[PDB]
Amino acid sequence: VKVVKNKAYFKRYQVKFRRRREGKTDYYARKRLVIQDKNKYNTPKYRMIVRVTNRDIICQIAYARIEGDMIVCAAYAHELPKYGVKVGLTNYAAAYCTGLLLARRLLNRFGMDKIYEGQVEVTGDEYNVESIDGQPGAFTCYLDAGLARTTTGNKVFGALKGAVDGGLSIPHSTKRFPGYDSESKEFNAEVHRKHIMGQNVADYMRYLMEEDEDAYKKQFSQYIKNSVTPDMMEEMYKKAHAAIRENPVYEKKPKKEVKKKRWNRPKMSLAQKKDRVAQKKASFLRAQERAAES
Amino acid sequence: RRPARCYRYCKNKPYPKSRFCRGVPDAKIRIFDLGRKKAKVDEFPLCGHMVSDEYEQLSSEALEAARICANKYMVKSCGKDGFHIRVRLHPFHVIRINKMLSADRLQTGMRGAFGKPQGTVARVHIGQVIMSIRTKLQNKEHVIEALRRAKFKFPGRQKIHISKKWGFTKFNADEFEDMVAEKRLIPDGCGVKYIPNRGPLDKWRALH
Amino acid sequence: AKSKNHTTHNQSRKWHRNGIKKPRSQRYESLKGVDPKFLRNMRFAKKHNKKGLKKMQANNAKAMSARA
Amino acid sequence: ENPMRELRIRKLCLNICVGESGDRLTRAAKVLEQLTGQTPVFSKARYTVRSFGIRRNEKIAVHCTVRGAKAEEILEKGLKVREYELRKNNFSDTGNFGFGIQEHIDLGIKYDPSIGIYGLDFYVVLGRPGFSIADKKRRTGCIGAKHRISKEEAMRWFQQKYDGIILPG
Amino acid sequence: TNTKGKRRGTRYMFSRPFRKHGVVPLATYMRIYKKGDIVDIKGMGTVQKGMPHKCYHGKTGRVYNVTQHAVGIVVNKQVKGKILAKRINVRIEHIKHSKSRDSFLKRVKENDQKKKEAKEKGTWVQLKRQPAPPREAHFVRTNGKEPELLEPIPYEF
RNA sequence: ACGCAGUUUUAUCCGGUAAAGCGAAUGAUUAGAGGUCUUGGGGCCGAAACGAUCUCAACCUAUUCUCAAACUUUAAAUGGGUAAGAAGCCCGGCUCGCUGGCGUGGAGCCGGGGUGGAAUGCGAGUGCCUAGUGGGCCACUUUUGGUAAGCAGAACUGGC
RNA sequence: CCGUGGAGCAGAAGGGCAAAAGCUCGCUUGAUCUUGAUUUUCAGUACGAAUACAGACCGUGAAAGCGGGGCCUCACGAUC
RNA sequence: GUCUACGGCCAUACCACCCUGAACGCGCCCGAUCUCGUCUGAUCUCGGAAGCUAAGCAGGGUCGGGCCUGGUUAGUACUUGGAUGGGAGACCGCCUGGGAAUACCGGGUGCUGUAGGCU
Ligand SMILES: [Mg+2]
Ligand SMILES: [Mg+2]
Numbered sequence A: 001v002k003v004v005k006n007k008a009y010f011k012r013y014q015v016k017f018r019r020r021r022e023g024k025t026d027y028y029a030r031k032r033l034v035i036q037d038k039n040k041y042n043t044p045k046y047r048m049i050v051r052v053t054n055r056d057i058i059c060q061i062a063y064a065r066i067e068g069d070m071i072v073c074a075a076y077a078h079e080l081p082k083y084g085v086k087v088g089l090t091n092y093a094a095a096y097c098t099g100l101l102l103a104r105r106l107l108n109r110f111g112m113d114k115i116y117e118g119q120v121e122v123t124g125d126e127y128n129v130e131s132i133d134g135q136p137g138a139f140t141c142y143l144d145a146g147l148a149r150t151t152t153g154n155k156v157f158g159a160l161k162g163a164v165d166g167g168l169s170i171p172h173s174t175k176r177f178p179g180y181d182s183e184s185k186e187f188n189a190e191v192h193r194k195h196i197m198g199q200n201v202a203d204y205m206r207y208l209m210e211e212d213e214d215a216y217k218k219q220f221s222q223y224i225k226n227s228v229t230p231d232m233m234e235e236m237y238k239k240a241h242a243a244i245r246e247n248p249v250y251e252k253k254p255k256k257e258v259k260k261k262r263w264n265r266p267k268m269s270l271a272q273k274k275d276r277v278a279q280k281k282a283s284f285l286r287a288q289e290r291a292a293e294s
Numbered sequence B: 001r002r003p004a005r006c007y008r009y010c011k012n013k014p015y016p017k018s019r020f021c022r023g024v025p026d027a028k029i030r031i032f033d034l035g036r037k038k039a040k041v042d043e044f045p046l047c048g049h050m051v052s053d054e055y056e057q058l059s060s061e062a063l064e065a066a067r068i069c070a071n072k073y074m075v076k077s078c079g080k081d082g083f084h085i086r087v088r089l090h091p092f093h094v095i096r097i098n099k100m101l102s103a104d105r106l107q108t109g110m111r112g113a114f115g116k117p118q119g120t121v122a123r124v125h126i127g128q129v130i131m132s133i134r135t136k137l138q139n140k141e142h143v144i145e146a147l148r149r150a151k152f153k154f155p156g157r158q159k160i161h162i163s164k165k166w167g168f169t170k171f172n173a174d175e176f177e178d179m180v181a182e183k184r185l186i187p188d189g190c191g192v193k194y195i196p197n198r199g200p201l202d203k204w205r206a207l208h
Numbered sequence C: 001a002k003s004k005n006h007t008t009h010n011q012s013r014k015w016h017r018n019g020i021k022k023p024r025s026q027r028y029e030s031l032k033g034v035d036p037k038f039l040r041n042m043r044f045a046k047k048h049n050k051k052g053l054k055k056m057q058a059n060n061a062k063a064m065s066a067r068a
Numbered sequence D: 001e002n003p004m005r006e007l008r009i010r011k012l013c014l015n016i017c018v019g020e021s022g023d024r025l026t027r028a029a030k031v032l033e034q035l036t037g038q039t040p041v042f043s044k045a046r047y048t049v050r051s052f053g054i055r056r057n058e059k060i061a062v063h064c065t066v067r068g069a070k071a072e073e074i075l076e077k078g079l080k081v082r083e084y085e086l087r088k089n090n091f092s093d094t095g096n097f098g099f100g101i102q103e104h105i106d107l108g109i110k111y112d113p114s115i116g117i118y119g120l121d122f123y124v125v126l127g128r129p130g131f132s133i134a135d136k137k138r139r140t141g142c143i144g145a146k147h148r149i150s151k152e153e154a155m156r157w158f159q160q161k162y163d164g165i166i167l168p169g
Numbered sequence E: 001t002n003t004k005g006k007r008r009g010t011r012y013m014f015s016r017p018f019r020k021h022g023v024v025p026l027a028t029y030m031r032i033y034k035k036g037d038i039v040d041i042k043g044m045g046t047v048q049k050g051m052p053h054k055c056y057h058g059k060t061g062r063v064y065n066v067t068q069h070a071v072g073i074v075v076n077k078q079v080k081g082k083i084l085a086k087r088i089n090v091r092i093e094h095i096k097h098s099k100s101r102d103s104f105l106k107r108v109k110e111n112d113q114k115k116k117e118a119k120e121k122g123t124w125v126q127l128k129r130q131p132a133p134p135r136e137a138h139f140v141r142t143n144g145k146e147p148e149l150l151e152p153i154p155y156e157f
Numbered sequence F: 001a002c003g004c005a006g007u008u009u010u011a012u013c014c015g016g017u018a019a020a021g022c023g024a025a026u027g028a029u030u031a032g033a034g035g036u037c038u039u040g041g042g043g044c045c046g047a048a049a050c051g052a053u054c055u056c057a058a059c060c061u062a063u064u065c066u067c068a069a070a071c072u073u074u075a076a077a078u079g080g081g082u083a084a085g086a087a088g089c090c091c092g093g094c095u096c097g098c099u100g101g102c103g104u105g106g107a108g109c110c111g112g113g114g115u116g117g118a119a120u121g122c123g124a125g126u127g128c129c130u131a132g133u134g135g136g137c138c139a140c141u142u143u144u145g146g147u148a149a150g151c152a153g154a155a156c157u158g159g160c
Numbered sequence G: 001c002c003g004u005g006g007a008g009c010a011g012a013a014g015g016g017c018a019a020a021a022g023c024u025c026g027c028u029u030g031a032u033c034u035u036g037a038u039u040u041u042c043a044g045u046a047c048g049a050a051u052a053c054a055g056a057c058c059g060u061g062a063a064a065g066c067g068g069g070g071c072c073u074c075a076c077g078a079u080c
Numbered sequence H: 001g002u003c004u005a006c007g008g009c010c011a012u013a014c015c016a017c018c019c020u021g022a023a024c025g026c027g028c029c030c031g032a033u034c035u036c037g038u039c040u041g042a043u044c045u046c047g048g049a050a051g052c053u054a055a056g057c058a059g060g061g062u063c064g065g066g067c068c069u070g071g072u073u074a075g076u077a078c079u080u081g082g083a084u085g086g087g088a089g090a091c092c093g094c095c096u097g098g099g100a101a102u103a104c105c106g107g108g109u110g111c112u113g114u115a116g117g118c119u
C-alpha cells in the first residue's frame, strides 16, 4: 500500500560479482596487485596471500592465469605442533612462524636451500633480501592484505617479516611494523623483537597471575592445561624456528579413503515435483469435499 | 483552422509532445469512453470495430466530431447505458504551421522555415482499429449504422468488422462461455484477468 | 546567390577509376614507433650478434654436418 | 529451551537538539559529559529552516552512544523516571524503542544554577548474538528472518524483564 | 557543420549493453598479446583513457608494439583518397583476439597431419577446401504414408 | 608459377536502423476493478470521542488503451574489417646492457626439412611533368524543411 | 530496515562509475624539466586537444602500482 | 558426497519465506594489558576457546518472482535486387534471396582450476 518496492527491480538488478556478494574480494586493489605489465608476455607475478581466520592463518604464494590462480606453495597454522608450537596458533609469533615456514618450504621446493639463509638470529632489523651475482637471484613477491585494514601491528606484517627473514625479496617499509611510534618517526627494533618473541603476552600472563586468577583460569585454559610458562615460551619459539629451518619438507598424510557416502539430500525430479503438486491438488479437493460437510 | 487537405498521409517523422516541443496547444479530445463506463464483461456480448485501410493521419477534431455523432446515434438507438464505445486511437503527432501575411512581401521569405505547433493528429497504420463499440446481441445493426455514419466523416476509405472476440478482451466468444465458468477467467470490472498455471498455490487456494 | 554547399555524389566512381590500392606489401616491416627500451635491447643484441656468433655456430654447423 | 538467543542491550543513544549553537549547546554537551564520563559528538546541516534561525553547518545537536553496563544503568535511570510504563507506539516495527525524558536532574544530577533545565532523548535498540554480521568489514551478510527482532518480541521482552506495562490507550 | 570533434556519434557504441555495468573482468587483462597477432577493436566505456576513436570500432588490426599496460596496433583505415595503414596505441581493455586466425592455424595443422599421413600411406587425400558441392542423386523414402495434400487456406480477417 | 580484384564462399568479429515493446528503466497517456494506510469534503448513531459506520480523494496491487527523431529488454535485411600460406610451419643453436627463482619469458641472428593448401576472372608494380575542373541538373529507392511545387537541401547507383 | 545508480561527479547534454570515478579525512604539488612517435580536422599540413612510451627529479601508498592537471567528449591563437 | 584460501565463467549461480547440517573447516562468541583507531573494543587491531549451529555459510523445497534456453507468434512484421505490375494518390500485389520481437506454453537453475583437511 505504501511503496512500489520490487516489480522490475528483480528484472533490472545487475549482480555485482560472485566473490563480491560473498564478501571476500574488492578488485579495486586486485586489478593493480595481480596483473603483470605486458612487456614480459609470460612472467608470473608472485603474491603472498595472508588470510586471518578464527583458529587459523593461511600464508600462500600464488600467481595468476586465465583459468584461475596457480598456487606454488602453501603454509598453515594447524601444522605448527608438528614443528613445535603446540598452542598459541593465531598470534604475531605464529604469524612470523608461519611466514618463516612458508619461505623455507618455498625455497626447499625451488632447491635454494644452501644459499639465501636470510636473517637467522631474529633481531627485528630491516634486513632486506639482497641478490648475489653469479647465483640464482632472489624471489620477488608482493603482499596481499585483502579486506583487512592495514594498521601498525597487523600480523599480515608479521607474516611479511617472516617471509623477509626467510629470504623472500619483498619491498616494504618499516613504519607499519609494530613498535613504530605514531608521533616520533624513529623505529624501535627491541620492541619489535619483543613482540616477535611474545614477551608482552608473557607479561600479561604475569599480570593475570598477579592481579586476578579468575581471568587467568577463565581464558588461557589450553595453555595451563597442557603447559605454558614464559621461559619455556622464549625457549620454545627459539627452538621452533630451528625446527622449521632444519626440516621444511612437508611430509603428507595418506588419508586414502574409507569410501562411504550419505550426507546430503539430492534433488527431486520433475515428475516427482509435478506429482507433489498433484497430491496437493487432490488433497485440497478432498478437503473441499470433506470439511464443507463436516 | 487550415483544411485537412494540407495535412494528410504520413511524410514526416513522429513529433510528439515532449521536452522538445513545449508549445503545443491542448488536443480537441480528452475523454474516450462515452457509454456505460462501469459496465461488466457479461453485460454486453458482442462488439464491432472500425478497421482502417489507408496508411493515413486522423485529426483530433475529426475524432471529436465522429465520437459526438456516434454517441448521438447510440443514445437515439439504444438509449443511455445501452452501449460502450471506446476510441482506440490516441493523438500524439504534432503538425507544424508556417503562417504568412502577418497582403505584402515585406515580412519574411523562407528565411526561418520551421513551424510552430498547430494541432495534434494521429498516425494510423493499415489495419489499426479506430473505434470499438460493445453492445447487446440485439444491437448488431445499430453498431453497423453508427460506424457507417462515422465512415462518411472520417477521411479515406475504411471498413467495418464485427469481432470474433468477446468484447475488448483477446479471448474468443465461443470459448468464453465455456471457459470463464470452469477454471481460468475471472471478471475484473470491464477487463478480464487471465491466470496461468505458473502461479503460487495460494491463489488457487483462494479460488475454488 | 545561394549555391550547393556539400555533397559526396560522384565520388566513389572517381575513386574506382584507379582501383583503390592497399599498401599490400612491406617485407621486413618498418621499425620506428616501437618501445625505446626494446630498441635499447635490440640494437645491442644485434651488434653483439655481429660480434660473437662466429665460433659457436661454426662448431654447431660442424656438429650437425657430422650427424646429418 | 532456546539455544543462546537472548535479547540484550546493543546500544543506547543520547540526543539533545538545541535550537541554536553556542552556550546552550555547549552546556548540553556538558550535561552529556556529566552522564557518560566521555565526550559527545556534534551534528550539522542537510536542512536550513530560517523560521527560528539555524544555518548550514552549525552545531545543532549533541549526541552520544553508550554500550554495556553504563548503557544498562542509564536505561535503568530512564525507566525509573518513566516508572516502567511505556506506550505501545514507542516500539518500532524493527524491535527498537525510544521514549525520551524531560527534567534531566531527575536522573540523579545535582542541579547547577548556570546550566539550566534540559531534556534528553533516550533510544534503546535490542541485540542478539550475531548482529556483527552486517557491521563487519569482511563478510557483510544478512541478519536473517527467524533471527530478526519484531514488535511482539520487543514488547514481550519489556513485559518479561523490568516488569513493564504496555499502556494500549 | 556536424562539429567533428571526438566521439560525436557514440551514444550507443561505447556503452555497455545490459547487465554488464560495473567493474571489468580480469580475463580481458590476462591474455597473451604478442607481435603479429591479429586482433579486433571493441570500445569500452569503463576505461576512459585509451579508447582509439569512433572510426576504429569493430575493425581488425595487427600488433606491432606491446608496452606496460597497452598495445600498438596497425589498422587499415579507409579514407577519401586510399586505404592507409595507421599506427594506433590502444589499451588492453579495448582489445580481444580474433578466432579466425586460430581456426586457420587449426586447418593448417590438420593439413600437415593429413599430408604426413599421405606421405606415409600413399593416399591422395584432397586437402583443398572445396566449397559446398551440388547434391548427388540420393534416394527418398515414402513408405507407410501417402504424401500429404496441401491446399491454401481461405482468407479470414 | 609471383601477384591483383567495386565479386562470391568458408570462419571470425563490429553496429542500434527497419521492426517490435513499454502488465520492462525514462517520458507521455486511457478506462474499469479490488484493498483499506492517510489526510481533505459531505451524512448517520449523539454533549463529544481513530467508539462504530455510509460516501469521496490520494496511494498501492493485478489489469487494460495508445505512442516516442533527440526512449529501449530484444533485434533483422543490407553493410564494414580480417584470414584463406613458402613473407607460412617444425627442429636445433648463439646474442641481449630488455625482463628475471630457473637455459624464465620475449626479440634478433644462424643452419636444415618438405610449396599440390577456396571459387571465378585478369599479365602486374612503380617514378616524373602537366592541362582542364573548382555555377550543376534529373530518375527509382531512404529522407530533412515546407500545404505543395518543374521549391530548397542530403545518401547509394545510373544518366544528361 | 528496504534501498542498481532512480543522487552526486563545477557548469549544456551524452557515455561511464557503489568496500567507485561519489562524500569525509592524512600528506603532497606529476598542473615539474627534456627528446621522439601516434590519434583527432585533414591535403594525411599546422594550431588546439589527447594517447602509449623513454630519460631525470619526485608525491602518495605497507607494497602492487597510480599521477607528467580536471573520469572522457570543447573551453582556445601564425609571421614580425 | 563436502568445506576452507585464492580464483575464471558473472544472476542456470540474485531476492522473499520454510526445513536439514554427522567430522574438519567457516563463524557467532569471551575481554582490552600491550600494536591500534573511535563518542562508544559498535567497526578495525591484540592473547584465547566456556557454548552454539539460533544467525552468517553449505544443501533441499516454493504449481515462487526474476535469469537462460526451446516451441508458438511467424515464413508474419521488415528487407537486397526487378518489372511499360495495379492504384488519381495513400499504398498494395508478384519474381529472387535473407528474415526479428512481446503476450501464450514447456525445461533448467550452477560448472570448474590451483593448494589444503575431514567421512
Ligand atoms: Mg586496498
Ligand atoms: Mg559549388
Ligand SMILES: [Mg+2]
Residues within 6 Å of the ligand: none
Ligand atoms: Mg545513431
Ligand SMILES: [Mg+2]
Residues within 6 Å of the ligand: none
Ligand atoms: Mg519504429
Ligand SMILES: [Mg+2]
Residues within 6 Å of the ligand: F131
Ligand atoms: Mg592548359
Ligand SMILES: [Mg+2]
Residues within 6 Å of the ligand: none
Ligand atoms: Mg534539389
Ligand SMILES: [Mg+2]
Residues within 6 Å of the ligand: none
Ligand atoms: Mg535552384
Ligand SMILES: [Mg+2]
Residues within 6 Å of the ligand: F159, F160
Ligand atoms: Mg545518355
Ligand SMILES: [Mg+2]
Residues within 6 Å of the ligand: none
Ligand atoms: Mg541496509
Ligand SMILES: [Mg+2]
Residues within 6 Å of the ligand: none
Ligand atoms: Mg550527465
Ligand SMILES: [Mg+2]
Residues within 6 Å of the ligand: none
Ligand atoms: Mg546517466
Ligand SMILES: [Mg+2]
Residues within 6 Å of the ligand: none
Ligand atoms: Mg578508494
Ligand SMILES: [Mg+2]
Residues within 6 Å of the ligand: none
Ligand atoms: Mg617518467
Ligand SMILES: [Mg+2]
Residues within 6 Å of the ligand: none
Ligand atoms: Mg587502551
Ligand SMILES: [Mg+2]
Residues within 6 Å of the ligand: none
Ligand atoms: Mg590510544
Ligand SMILES: [Mg+2]
Residues within 6 Å of the ligand: H041
Ligand atoms: Mg566484543
Ligand SMILES: [Mg+2]
Residues within 6 Å of the ligand: none
Ligand atoms: Mg538452522
Ligand SMILES: [Mg+2]
Residues within 6 Å of the ligand: H053, H055, H056
Ligand atoms: Mg549459522
